[PDB]
Amino acid sequence: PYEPLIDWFTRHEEVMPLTAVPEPKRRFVPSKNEAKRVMKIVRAIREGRIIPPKKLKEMKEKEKIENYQYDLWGDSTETNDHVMHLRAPKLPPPTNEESYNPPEEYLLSPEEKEAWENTEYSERERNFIPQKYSALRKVPGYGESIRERFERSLDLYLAPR
Amino acid sequence: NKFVRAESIVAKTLATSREKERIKRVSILEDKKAKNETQHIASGKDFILKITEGLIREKTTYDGKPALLFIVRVRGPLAVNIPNKAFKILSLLRLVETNTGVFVKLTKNVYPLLKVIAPYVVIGKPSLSSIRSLIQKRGRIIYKGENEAEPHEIVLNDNNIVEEQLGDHGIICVEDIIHEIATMGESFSVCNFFLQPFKLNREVSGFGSLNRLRKIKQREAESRTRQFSNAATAPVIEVDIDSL
Amino acid sequence: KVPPTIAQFQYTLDRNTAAETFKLFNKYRPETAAEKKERLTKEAAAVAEGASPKPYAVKYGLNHVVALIENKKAKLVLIANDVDPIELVVFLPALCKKMGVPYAIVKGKARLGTLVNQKTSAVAALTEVRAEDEAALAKLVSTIDANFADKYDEVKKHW
Amino acid sequence: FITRSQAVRKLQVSLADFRRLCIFKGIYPFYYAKDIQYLMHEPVLAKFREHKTFARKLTRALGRGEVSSAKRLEENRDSYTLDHIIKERYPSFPDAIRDIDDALNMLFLFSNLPSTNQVSSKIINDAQKICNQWLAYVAKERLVRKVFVSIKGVYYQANIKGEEVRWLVPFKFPENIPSDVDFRIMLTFLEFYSTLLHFVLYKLYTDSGLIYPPKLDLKKDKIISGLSSYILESR
RNA sequence: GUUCUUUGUAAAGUGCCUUCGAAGAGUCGAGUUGUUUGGGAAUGCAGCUCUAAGUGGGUGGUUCCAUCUAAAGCUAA
RNA sequence: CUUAGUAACGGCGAGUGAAGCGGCAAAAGCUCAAAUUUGAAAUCUGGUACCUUCGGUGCCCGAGUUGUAAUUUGGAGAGGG
């Protein structure tokens, strides 16, 4: 049922191509369809309906520079707190006595330094240890600063008002 | 642990052949330049190319004046393994890691070593804002941790850390480190090995939709804004570090 | 159970050879419809205000190809195995054998489409080539004749 | 009211994109039914869909091997603007200056950040540019009342159209970025506050002060890159 | 009739000389079961079984000769 | 209209019943599939912005090389000169 295909015809390679068709001029000469398209766009440029590729750069070198450069409020008197459902996002509490140079009674006792670290975060009165510094040069870069803005950002859209 | 293809393993050797022969060639002409035996070599002086931004190639000779450079690691070229002469210079400058900067002064001894590592580094004279913003944005200090651990590299957060480690040399703060780095002084060799290297983030920094195309755009911008001379009279390519 | 002239496919070109084929072939991309258009608008801008040589790109219509094999224009032919009607190509590896034109069954009909700006292709062929890659082609050909034509002399037989 | 799940499903939008729109629109929680029901018809949602179409049609070009068409897809790309989103959020100018309290705190933090694979250099340079514009104006028309240097940073108070804004600037040292924080939430807040600040600064300058935007001296930016640079003219 | 525009090495036609020169298959055909006719050379169609050719094939007339080119399509009165 | 109630068939019986020619009415022819645009799918659907809107144009999207356009249908036809 399954004989190997004995290639009785492909065994012998062909020398000449199958047909003796004369090759056209257009296979050697530059294309006339290309010439037709080119001489169509030429007309479109004379008429002015296609702006040339050289000037298209100049149309974007002069434009799209001005972003967000217009007044949108103007004479704006209308308040958005008209429906009672706009809960204004509450400006965070003003900072009370924790400066780089504090009155050193604010500086925490050694027992409460570890007791503060023992308490779980977010159920905690201060997000920081109050510290005393003699010089302004001696003030460290506060490491837990990105954490504070990130947590405030989360408090805006995830915490119920 | 992967299989290594044949094409890669021949490509590495074929590229290191060019790099070993290139480094030896630059080594010979720089050795013959120092010994004043300039009888029959290509050129007995030093040019510096300054490419700025429409890409103007300047050709100015290197003066004897000590200058301030910020060498930036690149990753180039493609199939190359680094030879012994590259391992040495990049160990001394502590630039084994890619995307990593360091400050050095450029003199008549520094400049011959610069031609060896030029296909691996991108150099240039920075400005006061490039230095000052770089130190206040990035900075490492290798010192002791809590009680036991030594290899902690943390951050230039404080100035009292600056006091404890430097102090008596006249350096008290981070801005004083910026002073001795921008202006070539006594404490430059003290603080240069204190900020060991910088950790610059890589360009584009992703493999994906937008990031591949942006890496393609920048990768073709590389060979335009940087050339590999390969000759023994290679002009050192200086680029804008304020832009970079 | 498969008759020998079917599954003369499935015995495709190997991994290393295949990539090297495209290494060559991706060099001969046809211009994209976007690119062709801009080229001509570049011409129109120029020729409206004030020479070119014939451009080599691979050849890709089944017709065009079956024209090209049998006319000797073709040098290398790439034939994708998985095609909706298999019959649409089954003759093609034999035709080429008969006109002595070097052919290789490639794997991935879509993979041909890549090299040619189309969705699929069934068949693409590199007729004419640049001066530098002329040698690259003729060697690839030989590589193909070894690992494909000579390796599978028994592809015309066995069910 | 409606559940988060019911809001996400009703919008037929991803949770991320639901939260992105929620950040832009100023919507907060159970959500309000008429609030989500009002979010549904909005240009920003449609532009998010357009970004998704662009994403696949680019990876189509990239994944095939054609680079020119992909580069062309970048040229034929418009993006969503947060212009009309503020008119419906802060209709009056004094209301926008009541929000600028929290807006200037993100932006002055993001100036003092090393650029990572999370956050590009263009993002930080544009944020720092707005920061310098803000500092230049407040030092121009002389609107400071209170200062407070703390461990955290340095607080300022400013009568900006007579309503006393407050904002915090950290100390100019490298900041250790934790891997804990999510730099995708913060980037959208930056994206909203950034545009809000552009429109605020245009309004301030074109009302009482100067041309917007002012130029910057190149060899001044080479020296300081701070506030003695960036010269600004009145008329 | 009146005008406004016509274009590009654009589109064809004629005669001569040379170089080539592919036209439809589960169809035609054959066997049989029904249907249609007034149909004698089962005509026409259907079902079912089998199923071709290329100096071919289909149809007609006294050993040739004439005649058309199926198995695709459109179309006023 | 005629051919014609003819040829032809019909337990040659109820009977069934054409056609070609001829004369007129009216008249008109044509399109694919077939061998390569291969020096460039040259073709179209749509979306969108305008315009003089049974449509035209630009720009984008797709469809399409398993073939969409030009040329050819035996009355030949095509390649060239």
Tally C-beta pairs within 8 A across A and B: 15
Q: How far is A49 from chain C (nearest CA, A)?
A: 12
* Nearest neighbour of A99 by CB, restricted to D27, D95, D148: D148
Domain span at residue A149 reads 86-159
Q: Do residues A153 and D189 touch, judged by C-beta distance below 8 A? A: yes
Q: What is the spatial distance between Cα C118 and Cα A39, in angstroms, rounded to a whole number?
A: 28
Q: What is the spatial distance between Cα D56 and Cα C11, in angstroms, rounded to a whole number?
A: 34
What is the sign of the dihedral through the CA atoms of D65, D67, D71 and D76? negative
Pick among C37, C111, C117 to test the D interface (most D CBs inside 10 A): C117
Burial C116-152 (b: 16+ CB within 10 A, else e): bbeebbbbbbbbbbeeeeeeebeebbebbeeebbeee
C1’ E53 / CA A82, Å: 93
Chains that touch D (3 or more CB pairs under 8 A): A, B, C
Q: What is the spatial distance between Cα B121 and Cα C104, in angstroms, rounded to a whole number?
A: 45
Q: Do residues D156 and D147 touch, judged by C-beta distance below 8 A? A: yes
Strand E at less than 7 A from CB of A11:
no
Count of C-beta atoms within a 10 Å radius of residue B102 = 19
Q: Which of B30, B184, B25 is nearest to B110 (CA)?
A: B30
Q: Which of D49, D21, D61 is nearest to D192 (CA)?
A: D21
Sheet of strand D146-149: strand arrangement: D146-149, D154-158, D165-169
CB contact set of D151 (below 8 Å; sequence gap of 6+): A98, A99, A100, A128, A130, A131, A139, A140, A142
- Tell me how the structure was determined: cryo-EM
CB contact under 8 A, D121 and B201: yes
Q: What is the spatial distance between Cα D206 and Cα D195, in angstroms, rounded to a whole number?
A: 17
Strand bridging mode B60-61 / C103-106: unpaired
Pick among A61, A100, A137, A146 to test the B interface (most B CBs inside 10 A): A137
Q: Do residues C67 and C40 touch, judged by C-beta distance below 8 A? A: no
Give me the residue label for tokens 């490419």.
B51
Amino acid at A17: P
CB contact under 8 A, D102 and A156: yes
Decide: helix, strand or coil at residue B203.
Answer: coil
C1’ E21 / CA C94, Å: 26
Pick among D28, D88, D147, D165 to test the A interface (most A CBs inside 10 A): D28
| CATH code at position C107 | 3.30.1330.30
Count of C-beta atoms within a 10 Å radius of residue B53 = 9
Q: Which of D190, D189, D192, D213 is nearest to D201 (CA)?
A: D213
**What's the distance, CA C86 to chain centroid?**
17
Q: What is the spatial distance between Cα A114 and Cα A129, in angstroms, rounded to a whole number?
A: 10
Each as own residue / partner, the long-range contacts of residues B54-59 (CB below 8 Å, 24 or more positions apart, any chain) are: B55/B224, B55/B225, B59/B235
Domain count, chain C: 1
Q: How far is A38 from chain D (nearest CA, A)?
A: 22
Terminal-to-terminal C-alpha distance of chain A: 82
- Is A140 near chain B, with CB under 8 Å? yes
CA of A18: nucleotide with nearest C1': F35
D90 neighbourhood in chain A, CB within 8 Å: 80
CB contact set of D97 (below 8 Å; sequence gap of 6+): D160, D161, D163, D165, D200
Strand E nucleotides within a 7 Å radius of protein CB atoms:
7-11, 19-22
CB contact under 8 A, A141 and B157: yes
Q: Do residues D201 and D129 touch, judged by C-beta distance below 8 A? A: no
